[PDB]
């Protein structure tokens, strides 16, 4: 065992040496001549009300119009952001919902939480009333995220340190990903839906191959847990935020961190991030009731979406880049522009 | 234009339902039931269940008031993430194994809960559920509480001690010493935003529900008074 650990330390040192060899220059120097974005003075344009308790997650529709929200009073609600009219009010079996999803074709939405079970709902039923269509079991820890590859495959990640791929039609785990030593928190599919990433509660991020069911790369550098993650639009980069009160940007080919976003005034932890359509603005949420705007290529801040009366716990951007939502333990969704 | 009437009709029907729900939601109290493994927690939970998956929910009502108690299960021991979900519960029951070094683990856990920021507004109830076992351990003499607790050597029964009939002075001394360790934690830095309610319990105490009922009522009254800025 001692020899194994020694030569493993040798491998880790070799990896660190290899990564260090590829760091010719800093990201800032390359973008040292990019003009500042300027003051992004965004303001609320709508306000959606009806939730009793806090809000954990929401997902946009593929048309940039419909969106679904999940709260801990046991309710899923599909709004029409153009007119703020409710369309459905879906009760839940387990009131501790910790995530939600919106199917690409717009027919299904899935949610799950401490119950460990990811449920599938149908929005195009013949009767017209949404009803359960498939309940997926097989995890042994609270489920913390879920996204749709298509109408027939949902990828789920849980707190027992394992991410799994499901075949909705049968309910079996076609594949299971392992290699994490802590809770897995957030993930996001690639633009092509070939690869996805997930950072866990060990300050590490791992890139996975969906087809082969095995880890492809590993990234480190954070000091504490990881709460949010997301792919850059081109699919060749992804930025992560941690409880250490910092955000960072990686690249799947550089195999190393390229930039960090930090400020001394910030002593709280991030809870959700997301990019813009052009991938030029890195939004983010914080525990101190604010949401910041980070100019991705310059490391600076360029705007604050203040207005929330409690922690921000979710965020997103429409597929066409028109509107941005936010949710909070205050129980109120806001639409900015 | 017909669609707008069709949609506006839909919204009204939905809003009628949510307002119907809102009333039901406020009439239910939520209680998280922590507890060490060897604490007899399951015994007290079964006691509540008889008289009236990653989580288990038990519903019971007292005096027409509805309490909703959630007991964790099938989770890993790393509590620092799925514990945030319980910031809005009315209270966090907490069973402890007094007679058991288990007790030090309970002290550290209680401190960690007390000083956490998201939970810095959720009052915690406290139970001590091995009084008979502690009494027999100390009475038998082969326990030597002094070795693990040197401070217990110079401790004396507090002036306000009220012992049950037939209770030996040594038993009372030990029992009340156990509690003092936690109260040192629960008094400092309290800030008056949340309190602790110690009790001495037994596995088969019928009135375990009554204590939590009264303490929930007290928490509600304190919150309301603080709202009006009286206390």
């Amino acid at each position, epitope marked *: 065992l001692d020899q194994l650990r020694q030569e493993a330390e040798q491998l880790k040192n070799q990896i660190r040496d290899a990564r260090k060899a590829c760091a010719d220059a800093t990201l800032s120097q390359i973008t040292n001549n990019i003009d500042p974005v300027g003051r992004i003075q965004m303001r609320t344009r709508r306000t959606l009300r009806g939730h009793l308790a806090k809000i954990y997650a929401m997902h946009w529709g593929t048309d940039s119009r419909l969106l679904v929200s999940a709260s801990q009073d046991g309710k899923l609600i599909i709004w029409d952001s153009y007119t703020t009219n409710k369309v459905h009010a879906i009760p839940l079996r387990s009131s501790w919902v910790m995530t939600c999803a919106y199917a690409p074709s717009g027919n299904y939405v899935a949610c799950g939480g401490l119950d460990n079970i990811c449920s599938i709902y149908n929005l195009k039923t013949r009767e017209g009333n949404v009803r359960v269509s498939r309940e997926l079991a097989g995890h042994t820890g609270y489920l913390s995220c879920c996204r749709f590859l298509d109408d027939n495959q949902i990828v789920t990640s849980s707190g027992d340190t394992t991410c799994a791929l499901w075949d909705i039609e049968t309910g079996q785990q076609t594949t299971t990903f392992t290699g994490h030593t802590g809770d897995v928190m957030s993930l996001s599919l690639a633009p092509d839906t070939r690869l996805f990433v997930s950072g866990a509660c060990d300050a590490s991020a791992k890139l996975w191959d969906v087809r082969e069911g095995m880890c492809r790369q590993t990234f480190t550098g954070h000091e504490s847990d990881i709460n949010a993650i997301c792919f850059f639009p081109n699919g060749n980069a992804f930025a992560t935020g941690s*409880d250490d009160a910092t955000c960072r940007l990686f690249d799947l080919r550089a195999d190393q961190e390229l930039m960090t976003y930090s400020h001394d005034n910030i002593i709280c932890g991030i809870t959700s991030v997301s990019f813009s359509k052009s991938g030029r603005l890195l939004l983010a949420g914080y525990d101190d009731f604010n949401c910041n705007v980070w100019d991705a290529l310059k490391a600076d801040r360029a705007g604050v979406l203040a207005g929330h009366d409690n922690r921000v716990s979710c965020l997103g951007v429409t597929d066409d880049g028109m509107a941005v939502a936010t949710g909070s333990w205050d129980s109120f969704l806001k639409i900015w522009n | 234009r017909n669609e707008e009437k069709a949609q506006r009709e839909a919204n009204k029907k939905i809003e009628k339902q949510l307002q119907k729900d809102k009333q039901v939601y406020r009439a239910t109290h939520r209680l998280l039931l922590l507890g060490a493994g060897e604490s007899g927690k399951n015994t007290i939970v079964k006691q509540m269940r008889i008289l009236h998956s990653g989580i288990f929910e038990t519903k019971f009502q007292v005096d027409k008031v509805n309490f909703h108690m959630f007991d964790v299960g099938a989770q890993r021991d790393e509590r620092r993430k799925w514990i945030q979900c319980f910031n809005d519960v009315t209270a966090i029951i907490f069973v402890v194994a007094s007679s058991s070094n288990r007790l030090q683990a309970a002290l550290k856990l209680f401190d960690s809960i007390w000083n956490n920021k998201w939970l810095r507004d959720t009052s915690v109830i406290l139970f001590l559920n091995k009084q008979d076992l502690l009494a027999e351990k100390v009475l038998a003499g082969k326990s030597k509480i002094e070795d693990y607790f040197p401070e217990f050597a110079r401790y004396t029964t507090p002036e306000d001690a009220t012992p049950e009939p037939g209770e030996d002075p040594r038993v009372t001394r030990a029992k009340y010493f156990i509690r003092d360790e936690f109260l040192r934690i629960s008094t400092a830095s309290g800030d008056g935003r949340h309190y602790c309610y110690p009790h001495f319990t037994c596995a088969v105490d019928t009135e375990n529900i009554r204590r939590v009922f009264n303490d929930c009522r007290d928490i509600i009254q304190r919150m309301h008074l603080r709202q009006y800025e009286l206390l």
Partner: nanobody
Amino acid sequence: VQLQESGGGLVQPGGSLRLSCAASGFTFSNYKMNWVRQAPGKGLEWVSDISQSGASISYTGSVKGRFTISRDNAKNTLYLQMNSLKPEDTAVYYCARCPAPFTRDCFDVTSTTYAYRGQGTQVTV
């Protein structure tokens, strides 16, 4: 997060020995630290923790007055001084860290599979 213990060895009962824990990979001053040991056939047991700057201290009752805790934030180190060992204290010592910075709570440091926990050194009497 890298934790590197050192200073173990063999000592006759009643002797003395010092444990020197070295750390790197994060801002040392911000994190509350602990010493936690594992004896054979026993679950993890807690010993002593010290605050960010050394203001506060604590011990488990059994080791009261025997050991001592101390840290040097200037040198990225944690220390433990032992005196008058007893036969029933043979165990491995895990230099430990609390998860989140700038906080006072230290959830689940003694967990079975904590992430920010050192490999540890052996001290036998």
